[PDB]
């Protein structure tokens, strides 16, 4: 499974490519002008290998303001496949949904997961 975002939302974003690159190390702005965009998505991509089919993946984040066409789950909160497929009108394979229910069981308060795929 996969906790991260997409390598292209991960590069947009300073704070996430740091973090998720280095747990303590940090990144400065400049460096990422230096280094070429394309040359960028390679060094992600070498490092997971490449992929062509999709996986389901998602992230922690802390309780948003308000906004609109987001979907946000409740920590502590039971999540079944169904209301996964009300919400995006799209089939969830059962094993992934059964995970991600067990997921929802041990998560600890105050984290919230966001759930999203390109289409």
Same mark, same amino acid.
């Given at each position: 499974?996969?906790?991260? &975002?997409?390598?292209?939302?991960?590069?947009?974003?300073?704070?996430? $490519? !740091?973090? &998720?690159?280095?747990? *303590?190390?940090?990144? !400065? #702005? =400049?460096?990422?002008?230096?280094? !070429?965009?394309?040359?960028? %998505?390679?060094?992600? %991509?070498?490092?997971?290998?490449?992929? #062509?089919?999709? #996986?389901? !993946?998602?992230? %922690?984040?802390? #309780?948003? =303001?308000?906004?609109?066409?987001?979907? &946000?789950?409740?920590?502590?909160?039971?999540?079944?496949?169904?209301? &996964?497929?009300? *919400?995006?009108? %799209?089939?969830?394979?059962?094993?992934?949904?059964?995970?991600?229910?067990?997921? *929802?069981?041990?998560?600890?308060?105050?984290? $919230?997961?966001?759930?999203?795929?390109? *289409?």
């Amino acid at each position: 499974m996969s906790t991260q &975002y997409t390598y292209q939302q991960i590069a947009e974003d300073f704070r996430l $490519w !740091s973090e &998720y690159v280095d747990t *303590a190390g940090e990144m !400065s #702005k =400049d460096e990422f002008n230096s280094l !070429s965009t394309e040359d960028k %998505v390679r060094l992600q %991509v070498e490092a997971f290998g490449e992929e #062509k089919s999709p #996986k389901f !993946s998602t992230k %922690v984040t802390t #309780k948003p =303001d308000f906004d609109g066409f987001q979907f &946000y789950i409740e920590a502590g909160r039971d999540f079944d496949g169904d209301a &996964y497929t009300e *919400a995006y009108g %799209v089939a969830v394979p059962t094993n992934i949904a059964a995970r991600i229910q067990a997921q *929802a069981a041990e998560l600890n308060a105050g984290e $919230w997961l966001l759930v999203e795929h390109e *289409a």
